[PDB]
């Protein structure tokens with residue numbers, strides 16, 4: 001009787017082969033996301049769960065799954081997992097601290113450039129077959145000589161700052177805690193107040209987790225302070241911004257653009273979670289969107305799955321998992 | 329009697345105000361490109377011309393405009409301007425050496441990320457209203473741990489190299505003349521043969537002017553060498569590549585993607601240029617295109633127009649324009 005491991009989404013064959021000698025595998029080798037009800041059913045007598053972005057684990061889920069020893073998350077932002085409840089029940093919660101960082105930072109910079117330069121409309125125009133040569137059109141905003149503000153300066157904030165080093169921009173950030181002097185000085189980063197960040201940045205790049213303190217942090221009040229025409233890029237979590245306030249800011253022309261890889265409709269732990277992205281936001285010309293593909297780099301996804309798998313195996317062997325989010 | 333200046337495309341009002349005290353202005357303050365016949369009509373008795381990327385000046389053009397003393401180009405690559413004919417006829421030709429470099433480099437890296445990460449299709453999907461959370465589609469290629477190859481290492485090549493410093497890539501390049509060692513070492517650039525560049529790069533970024541030597545340089549022979557899935561980005565000139573060879577390499581799935589800001593159809597000096605981009609190339613999913621917007625940054629275009637205007641004014645005053653491309657008596 002090997003301990004039962006429920007894997008909620010498809011995994012590489014290499015990962016199944018890695019886990020097989022140690023676990024009874026209850027797998028979902030399809031392209032689909034299963035219902036919460038079905039996931040809960042599978043986990044009833046499970047000793048381990050490998051969880052992904054669409055998964056949500058609350059105190060009630062854990063209570064109904066009394067044999068769970070570890071939830072190994074194949075992600076960085078564990079906002080949909082009740083860590084406190086995991087700890088109270090003696091359940092390890094693990095994440096993937098580094099592997100998602102660089103692919104997400106690359107995408108965020110791609111979105112900043114694409115948004116500033118009208119990539120969406122530009123490509124549509126060429127693809128229409130109507131291109132006849134250069135025109136005095138599609139004039140946009142570049143990074144050279146601009147001020148770029150980072151909200152949050154953890155892994156992704158740092159990775160984005162690294163990647164903007166040759167770009168002729170003035171870099172500033174707001175964080176809860178100051179970056180160490182050497183890193184600040186290396187990256188040419190200046191620490192500013194949150195309001196100052198919004199008032200003086202031409203590009204605003206969000207790099208915050210979603211928690212109680214950051215929920216709707218980017219609200220109407222804060223957006224009212226932005227330089228007219230400022231560009232906002234959200235590769236972190238949807239609910240860090242109030243998308244309705246963002247749309248309003250775009251429509252009044254105070255916000256020059258919004259680019260996002262993440263959306264409020266994805267934040268399952270919210271009882272009042274928006275069920276869709278507002279069609280008016282989707283239709284706005286000053287936007288650029290991606291469907292949570294921040295870590296969707298082909299080579300990286302096997303490594304992410306492997307990280308989660310190794311953490312799960314450590315927990316099942318009675319070790320402290322290397323990437324445990326909590327302490328028991 | 330003031331010298332007549334023909335400005336073929338829309339400029340900022342400030343530039344009109346700068347020029348008006350010294351020139352009779354014949355303007356095109358619309359978003360349209362006028363016909364060559366209309367431009368010739370306007371330029372017949374003009375002393376000056378401010379020219380843009382859609383313009384083409386050949387021997388015949390100059391012959392029809394015997395009073396022209398300066399053509400001030402609001403651009404860097406003057407491949408559609410016969411400089412030899414200008415020089416022979418005593419006409420200054422001026423360009424903009426540096427201002428276009430940085431915004432074009434920014435775009436090219438944007439195109440590299442956009443192409444590698446299926447940004448075009450990803451955005452189309454989200455906007456459909458059918459987004460249902462994290463999903464299995466749109467897995468792509470990143471720059472981290474990838475080999476990035478630059479063909480050419482002039483202003484744009486160097487600007488791109490500068491901008492990729494923190495990206496965790498292995499950078500290599502081919503040029504006719506190598507950079508010095510200190511620069512190569514600081515930027516982590518290794519010089520390789522052209523064939524090796526194409527056989528070993530995950531991303532290939534073009535940074536060449538269009539001339540006799542570079543016309544169709546990126547042809548079937550070179551594309552046949554690439555790693556399955558290699559991504560090609562062209563921010564320089566369309567005709568540096570053979571777009572038919574590119575399409576074929578895409579269709580067989582050897583070339584992973586092609587992103588371009590520039591197209592063979594724009595290269596007016598070529599008598600055998602295509603008149604459009606192949607519909608099949610436009611229809612291919614592994615592509616990302618922009619309509620020659622390399623320097624389309626609002627603040628930069630203003631400074632580009634200012635540069636062309638200043639050069640024109642210098643020439644009309646009887647002095648050598650600071651950014652003259654040619655030398656006269």
Ligand SMILES: NC(=O)c1ccc[n+]([C@@H]2O[C@H](COP(=O)([O-])OP(=O)(O)OC[C@H]3O[C@@H](n4cnc5c(N)ncnc54)[C@H](OP(=O)(O)O)[C@@H]3O)[C@@H](O)[C@H]2O)c1
Pocket residue numbers: 076077078097100101104151152153154155156157174175176177207208209210213214235236237261262292293294295
């Ligand atoms: N789009 C994607 O595919 C993708 C991929 C990976 C991650 N993400 C999301 O992006 C988030 C950030 O990722 P990361 O790897 O950079 O996480 P990280 O390394 O934990 O960095 C987050 C930073 O934000 C700071 N912070 C927290 N609350 C703050 C507040 N109220 N004001 C200012 N700063 C605050 C934290 O500082 P303290 O240490 O002081 O709390 C931390 O330094 C993740 O939590 C995840 O939700 C998205």
Ligand SMILES: NC(=O)c1ccc[n+]([C@@H]2O[C@H](COP(=O)([O-])OP(=O)(O)OC[C@H]3O[C@@H](n4cnc5c(N)ncnc54)[C@H](OP(=O)(O)O)[C@@H]3O)[C@@H](O)[C@H]2O)c1
Pocket residue numbers: 404405428429432480481482483484485502503504505535536537538541542563564565589590620621622623
């Ligand atoms: N998309 C846009 O909007 C946009 C904007 C600006 C420029 N451009 C285009 O991009 C081109 C490059 O721009 P740039 O500013 O980098 O020009 P650049 O500073 O003149 O650099 C071009 C480099 O290519 C090299 N080269 C010339 N012929 C070559 C050959 N046959 N083989 C290998 N290398 C060769 C040159 O070196 P040598 O000294 O050895 O010849 C030079 O170092 C421009 O000419 C223009 O056509 C496009």
